Structure formats: structure tokens, C-alpha cells
Amino acid sequence: SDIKAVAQRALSLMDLTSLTNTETDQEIIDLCRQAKSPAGETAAICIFPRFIPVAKKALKAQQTPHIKIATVTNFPQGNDDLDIALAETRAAVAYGADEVDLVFPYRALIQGNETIGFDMVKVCKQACSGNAKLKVIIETGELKSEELIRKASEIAINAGADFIKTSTGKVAINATPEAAKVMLTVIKNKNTAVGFKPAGGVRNADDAAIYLDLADNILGNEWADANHFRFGASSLLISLLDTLGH
Amino acid sequence: SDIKAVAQRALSLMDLTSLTNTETDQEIIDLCRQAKSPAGETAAICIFPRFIPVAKKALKAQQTPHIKIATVTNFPQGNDDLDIALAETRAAVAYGADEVDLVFPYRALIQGNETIGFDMVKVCKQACSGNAKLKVIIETGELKSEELIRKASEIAINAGADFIKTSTGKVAINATPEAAKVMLTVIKNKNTAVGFKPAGGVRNADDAAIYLDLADNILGNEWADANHFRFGASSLLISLLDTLGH
């Protein structure tokens, strides 16, 4: 089968994630070590903001500057308080984050407020400029309908998202093929320089193949590189390594 | 009662502190609610940086905007990594901190390195410039000798500290009368605009009265206001309230 090539590609696109909120410094350092895997480096790691300085030091020491540090803000609830989301994003940037995964206020959109979503992504993009990329989590599992998923994707991109992301991993339904298709379609129609990040429930190479196949069909075989595509996952890495015989 | 006069004074100078590192948002909100006591507002609360936005919302919600939000960095170990301490301080400010309690690299000082402590305080002070006050924790319990306690105090003040603070609360010996006398004397001799914060072990009004008397005797009855004196404590508030009859 084609499963090993898929596994290799997926691994290089991973945001290797630990978000238990009870990590120790040692566990953060181990995560940095694991990101440098026998089958190549992941695109990035993803951790809570306070761990960024320890991670930055660990990544420098093992000489992996191409492994970026992602973090999360307004996470995971996606509340509609702009001052809080902005302060957290500024802090993340001040910590040294390379990327900030911001949770879009999806409940406010559901209730019919499209403005708060736009304003929040916009100010957080401004705060990131010259320091970090902005990924926006729209929580497709809660948005449910194709209409809202499309809408949220369009608003996020209009407001300045560098990536659009499916899920926080913290609700019942996270990444799904149908949600992925809608978001990739919005990217193709609006801005192919905006990246896509399926996250939550991506267990193995088979799952990974689902989303890579969609990106390939919709935007072309060459589109999904580390600057256009990420897998938000944790235990996926162990699975991929096993598929690759490590 | 003379001691009720003390309980009232000490209460108004408190940094009501919770640093378990497992706080919930509700526990942070509860802490703010406690800062608004039946005997008046404390000077500040002190919490880990990630809780600052929620606390700020909670204090505004209860219409107590003048209760300061302090936080901690390089805490509690006081390592000698400037880049880490700087990043954490920048983040604390970006979160919205009114005050940052930085732990001085006291082990480095004990080892004969004076420059790293000076440099750390200076860049962290510059990081606070125009947004926050900087408290410097010198850890008198570990410095032990009067010479070292005096030295750390002088370094902190010369490098730009707004307060010098006795202890983290995390070592064997925290706030002591003897360490307070040394630190207040340096303040009197060098820069009377620099505040003093005894922390850890101040259980009640009698304990409070000890440090307030030292400040009064050394610098004058008028010197010790919320801009020059703080109590770093937790359980002390319940005791003071019990003294004032609440």
C-alpha cells in the first residue's frame, strides 16, 4: 500500500502536541526530543504558553530551529471576550511563540454575532505580526452545519488568519472529513496562502491519509507543505513511527 | 484596640496570594471576591501569570479596579537564565500585570556572581517600563548572612527594583525580623522610593506589627503606605478579619 509514504508526509506536518496543563519542564524537554524523531522532524510542537521559554532553550540545544513553537489562546472555550483573547495572544508572543492557535468565538457566531469573531481574529493578527503566525480554531464539531463552517472559515480568513483549524480536541466531535472539505474549499476559493490544520482524533496514518487526500484533490498534490498544512495531534506520532518501522 | 489598628493597616497593605499552580477560574474569582473584604480592599492579589486576564475581568466585574494584580516570574527557583526570566516578565506584562515579583538569582550571587543578578533585574525592569512595577525577591532565608542580604538588596535597587521582597515562601526560612531590618536599612541609606515586602510566615496581626514597627522606626511613621510596603501572605487575611471581628 501507499501507507508509509503517507506516514512520512504526515509526520513532517505534525504539530506535536501536549496540552494537559500539568506538564513538568522535563516533560516539555522530552517533547522537544521526540519532535526530533528517527523518521525526521515534525513541523512544530504545541504547548501551553508558560512552557515556551523552556522549549525554546531545549530546541536550540538540539539544534532544531525549524521545529517551531506553537501555543493556544482563548482555549478551549472560545469565549467572546476580546480583551482576554488579546491579552493571552500578546503574552504568547512575548513568551516567544512562533505560532498561536486562537479559538474563534464560535458560540457567538452560532447566536448570530459575526462581528466579535472578525474583531478578535483581527486584533490577534495585529499582535502576532512580525513575531508569529496566527492559526484560528473554529470548532467544526460544534458549528456542525456546512453553512456555519464555511462562514466561520471566511470570517477568519477575512480577519487575517494564517491558518484555519478544525478543532480544539476538547469537544465531542473534532476533525471530520466533511468539515475538512468545506474548509479546504474555502481556502481554494479565497486564499491558497492560508493553511489548513485538521486536529483532534487523528490517530494514525489511515486518518492522516483522509485529510491529505482531500487537500491533494482540492488544491493539488504539491500544495500541502509545512507552511500550508499541519496535523494537530499527540499520540499520532507513535503510530506513524510504528508504521515506518521505528 | 491598638491591635485592631494594626489588623486594619496590614490588611490594606496585603498582596492576597494564591500560587498553588492548579487554580481554577472559579478559585481565581473567589480570590478576587476575598480581596474585597468586609474591612476594605487589600492592596493587591498575587497569582500565576495565566490567571491575570480572568482576575482582571473579575475585579472590574465587582467594581474594584484599584486592587492591583501582581504575579511571579523566575519563580520559585531563582535560576540564573536571563533569557527565561526576561521572556516570562515580558509575558506577565503583556497579560496585564500591574506588578511582577521577580526571583533574584541568589544562588549565583552566593557563588560570587553579582553581574547576572544586576543584569536580570535591569532588563526585567525595562520590560516593565510604563506598564508595571517590579518587585525583586532576594530570598533572605537562603542568603542568610547580613552581608549577602545587604548586597542583594543594593544590587536590586541599583538595577531598578521598585520593591525588594524577602522570600518566595518556598524555602525553609522566609520572612524574619532580622532580614527586614537589614533590607529597610539599605532602603533608608540608598533610595527611599523603593518599597519593602516581607513574605511567607506572617500569620497574624502580631506578626504584622513586627515588620510595620521596623519600617516606622527606620524610615518614619509616614513611610509605609501601599506604594512602599506590602504583606505577601495568604491565610493572614482570615486572621486579620477575625481580629477586626468579621
Q: What does the alpha-carbon distance between residue B140 and residue B127 come to, in Å, rounded to a whole number?
A: 25
Grid coordinates of B148: 549577602
Q: What does the alpha-carbon distance between residue B170 and residue B17 come to, in Å, rounded to a whole number?
A: 13
Q: Is the dihedral of CA A98, B23, A83, B32 positive or negative?
A: negative
Nearest CA in chain A to B54: A84
Instruction: Name every residue whose Cβ is closer than 8 Å to that of residue B211 and which is 6 or more positions away in sequence.
Output: B175, B177, B180, B198, B202, B231
| B156-179 burial code (b ≥16 CB/10 A, e <16) | bbebbbbbbbbbbbbeebbbbeeb
Nearest CA in chain B to A53: B84
Helix axes B52-61, A82-95, angle to 10 degrees: 150
Alpha-carbon gap: A204 to the closest alpha carbon of chain B (Å): 32
Identify which of A241, A237, A153, A240 has the alpha carbon closest to the alpha carbon of residue A197: A153
Q: What does the alpha-carbon distance between residue B124 and residue B46 come to, in Å, rounded to a whole number?
A: 18
Nearest CA in chain B to A56: B84
Mutate which: A26, A56, A57, A88, vs B, most B CBs within 10 A: A88
Cβ B84–A49 below 8 Å, yes or no? no
Alpha-carbon gap: A92 to the closest alpha carbon of chain B (Å): 7
Chain B residues in contact with A56 (beta carbon < 8 A): 87
Q: Judge whether B82 and B116 are in contact, CB under 8 Å.
A: yes
Q: Judge whether B236 and B202 are in contact, CB under 8 Å.
A: yes
Grid coordinates of B73: 516570574
Residue in the block written with cell 480577519:
A159
Q: Judge whether B71 and B101 are in contact, CB under 8 Å.
A: yes
Cβ B91–A94 below 8 Å, yes or no? yes
CB pairs under 8 A between A and B: 55
Q: Judge whether A71 and A99 are in contact, CB under 8 Å.
A: yes
Q: Judge whether B88 and B49 are in contact, CB under 8 Å.
A: yes
Nearest CA in chain B to A22: B22
User: Helix, strand, coil: what percent of chain B each, to 5?
Assistant: 50, 15, 35
Q: What does the alpha-carbon distance between residue B236 and residue A144 come to, in Å, rounded to a whole number?
A: 50
Helix axes B236-243, B2-12, angle to 10 degrees: 140
Longest dimension (CA), chain A: 50
Cβ B88–A50 below 8 Å, yes or no? yes
Q: What does the alpha-carbon distance between residue B33 and residue B55 come to, in Å, rounded to a whole number?
A: 10
Grid coordinates of A47: 504547548
Mutate which: A95, A100, A126, vs B, most B CBs within 10 A: A95
Q: What does the alpha-carbon distance between residue A153 and residue A182 come to, in Å, rounded to a whole number?
A: 9
Q: What does the alpha-carbon distance between residue B115 and residue B117 come to, in Å, rounded to a whole number?
A: 5
Q: Judge whether B16 and B45 are in contact, CB under 8 Å.
A: yes
In whole angstroms, how far apart are CA B185 and each of B150, B194, B246? 9, 11, 36
Integer distance in angstroms from the first to the last C-alpha of chain B?
Answer: 15
Helices (H), chain B: 2-12, 25-35, 52-61, 82-95, 106-110, 115-128, 140-143, 146-159, 177-190, 205-219, 236-243
Nearest CB partner across the interface for A95, out of B54, B57, B87: B87
Identify which of A150, A137, A45 has the alpha carbon closest to the alpha carbon of residue A85: A137
Grid coordinates of A194: 492560508
Instruction: Name every residue whose Cβ is closer than 8 Å to that of residue A13 and which is 6 or more positions away in sequence.
Output: A42, A43, A224, A225, A226, A229, A230, A231
Cβ B49–A48 below 8 Å, yes or no? no
Domain limits at B183? 1-246
Chain B residues in contact with A95 (beta carbon < 8 A): 87-88, 90-91
Question: Which of helix, strand or coil describes residue B70?
Answer: strand
Q: What does the alpha-carbon distance between residue B134 and residue A42 come to, in Å, rounded to a whole number?
A: 39
Q: What does the alpha-carbon distance between residue A37 and residue A30 come to, in Å, rounded to a whole number?
A: 11
Pairing of strands A231-233, B195-197: unpaired
Cβ A84–B52 below 8 Å, yes or no? no
Residues of A marked active site are found at: 101, 165, 197
Alpha-carbon gap: A22 to the closest alpha carbon of chain B (Å): 8
CATH classification of the domain holding A30: 3.20.20.70
Q: What does the alpha-carbon distance between residue A212 and residue A180 come to, in Å, rounded to a whole number?
A: 10
Chain A residues in contact with B81 (beta carbon < 8 A): 57
Nearest CA in chain B to A79: B54
Please name the method used to determine this structure: X-ray
In whole angstroms, how far apart are CA B216 and each of B174, B189, B211? 21, 15, 9
Q: What is the number of residues in chain B?
A: 246
Nearest CB partner across the interface for A94, out of B52, B57, B87: B87
Chain A residues in contact with B87 (beta carbon < 8 A): 52-53, 56, 94-96
Q: What does the alpha-carbon distance between residue B246 and residue B239 come to, in Å, rounded to a whole number?
A: 9
**Chain A residues with at least one Cβ partner in B under 8 Å:** 22, 48-50, 52-54, 56-57, 81, 83-84, 87-88, 90-96
> Within 10 Å of residue A26's Cβ, how many Cβ atoms?
9
Report which secondary-structure segment, H or E, holds A231.
strand A231-233
Nearest CB partner across the interface for B49, out of A50, A84, A93: A50
Q: What does the alpha-carbon distance between residue B205 and residue B5 come to, in Å, rounded to a whole number?
A: 9
Q: Judge whether B197 and B164 are in contact, CB under 8 Å.
A: yes
Q: What does this entry list as its resolution, in Å?
A: 2.1
Cβ B88–A95 below 8 Å, yes or no? yes
Nearest CA in chain A to B90: A94
Pairing of strands B133-137, B163-165: parallel
Q: What does the alpha-carbon distance between residue B197 and residue B164 come to, in Å, rounded to a whole number?
A: 6
Instruction: Name every residue whose Cβ is closer than 8 Å to that of residue B175 and which is 6 or more positions away in sequence.
Output: B140, B166, B167, B198, B199, B200, B201, B202, B211, B232
Q: Judge whether B71 and B46 are in contact, CB under 8 Å.
A: yes
> Within 10 Å of residue A172's Cβ, how many Cβ atoms?
6
Chain B residues in contact with A74 (beta carbon < 8 A): none
* Domains contained in chain A, number: 1
Pairing of strands B40-41, B36-37: antiparallel
**Chain B residues with at least one Cβ partner in A under 8 Å:** 22, 48-50, 52-54, 56-57, 81, 83-84, 87-88, 90-96
Q: Judge whether A138 and A106 are in contact, CB under 8 Å.
A: yes
